């Protein structure tokens, strides 16, 4: 029926063997015969819900329902590029004698994530090489490598022969500027991981330097981005057009991810039903089989996103999404101010 085809066309991204169909968003006023797709704030506030399905340290998965791609992709892009963090930009090097080149060492120290909460610091102004309490942190790395005064006669392995032959990010000591030592309790300003190798030494070699962490967004440089990866996927709804029984139920449960099709016994007979279509990765193995291409409709619900935000440790991911939403609110607020300034 024409009406049934229209409903699929405006509500399901369907996956073919050779290409995806119904990709674009179409629910705009005048695109359809009887539908009234004009903006209605009450219809939005009714349908929209958020379900947090998993959360722990550094990871978060949640569902947004009823929002469009043009806004969910804005949240994805803010988290990558426009949420600010604190990262090293200047390294002042005194007596680097390691094999690691100074330009390579400075690049590595930039990429270490710093646990400093970026809301408490301002942007450093143009120029201003020193900076101040308001807008910079400071770290001091200083490692000297020496021989171990006692060692077994075989003397084979580095971890016995030498001490400080590996530099680790735990050697970074925070150096407070101004009243920062009272505002932050001890241990708050630290590198996150406590195990990142930077250099690697041999006795007589020395590293002494001084870092300056400032605030910046991820559009500038990629060491400022707070997310491991931030992405989304539309939710699958794999549907069975004809009942698949017998020993075709087993081979239908192996053309998918290992937890979505269940085979159940109803009369001592195996019938297959979809159980958890969320766990499907869409490897499209139902189209290699020749008998079962015509019993499934691999699809995607358009207005149901499954966000996955993995943080790098600067601030937890529930605060990251809240900060990201405020940035888009801030972008809209700025141009409203300039329409008021002109008119």
């Amino acid at each position: 029926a024409a009406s049934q085809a229209v409903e699929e066309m405006r509500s399901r991204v369907v996956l073919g063997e050779f290409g995806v169909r119904n990709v674009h968003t179409t629910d705009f006023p005048g695109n359809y015969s009887g539908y009234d797709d004009a903006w209605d704030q009450d219809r939005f506030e009714k349908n929209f819900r958020v379900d947090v399905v998993h959360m722990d340290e550094n990871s978060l998965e949640f569902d947004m329902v009823g929002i469009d791609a043009a806004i969910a992709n804005a949240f994805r892009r803010i988290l990558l590029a426009e949420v600010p963090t604190m990262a090293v930009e200047k390294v002042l090097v005194y007596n680097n004698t390691s094999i690691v080149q100074d330009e390579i060492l400075a690049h590595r120290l930039g990429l270490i994530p710093i646990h400093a909460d970026p809301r408490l610091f301002e942007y450093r102004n143009q120029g201003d090489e020193e900076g101040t309490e308001i807008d910079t942190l400071q770290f001091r790395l200083q490692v000297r490598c020496t021989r171990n005064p006692h060692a077994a006669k075989d003397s084979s392995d580095p971890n016995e022969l030498y001490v400080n032959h590996k530099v680790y990010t735990r050697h970074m000591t925070w150096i407070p500027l101004g009243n920062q030592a009272d505002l932050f309790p001890e241990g708050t300003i630290r590198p996150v991981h406590d195990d990142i190798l930077i250099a690697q030494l041999r006795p007589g070699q020395e590293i002494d330097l001084l870092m300056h962490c400032v605030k910046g967004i991820g559009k500038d440089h990629a060491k400022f981005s707070p997310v491991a990866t931030a992405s989304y996927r539309l939710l699958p709804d794999i549907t069975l057009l004809e009942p698949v029984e017998g020993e075709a139920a087993e081979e239908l449960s192996r053309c998918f991810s290992p937890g979505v099709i269940e085979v159940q016994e109803v009369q001592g007979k195996k019938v297959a039903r979809v159980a958890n279509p969320r766990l499907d990765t869409f490897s499209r193995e139902i189209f290699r089989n020749e008998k079962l291409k015509k019993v499934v409709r691999l699809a995607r619900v358009r207005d149901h996103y499954i966000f996955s935000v993995e943080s790098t440790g600067v601030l937890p991911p529930d605060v990251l999404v809240s900060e990201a939403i405020k940035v888009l609110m801030g972008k809209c607020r700025r141009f409203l101010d300039e329409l008021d300034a002109v008119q």
Binding site: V100, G204, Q205
Partner: protein
């Protein structure tokens, strides 16, 4: 020369997995079990450890010392 701090493709911190990865391979895990135990789900992170060459462990012999 030395293990990169972040994965090029996504920015996960893989630079602290290296000293663990060599340790697990002494306990005779396979490479595909060792990377799964460290949390490298995506293959862009997996190739950081799988394709790395530890050159600095060998350049540091020639390097001068007391």
């Amino acid at each position: 020369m030395i293990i990169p701090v972040r994965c090029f493709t996504c920015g996960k911190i893989v630079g602290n997995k290296w000293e663990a990865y060599l340790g697990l391979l002494q306990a005779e895990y396979t490479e595909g079990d060792a990377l799964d135990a460290l949390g490298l789900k995506r293959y862009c992170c997996r190739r950081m450890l799988l394709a790395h060459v530890d050159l600095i462990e060998k350049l540091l012999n020639y390097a001068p010392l007391e």
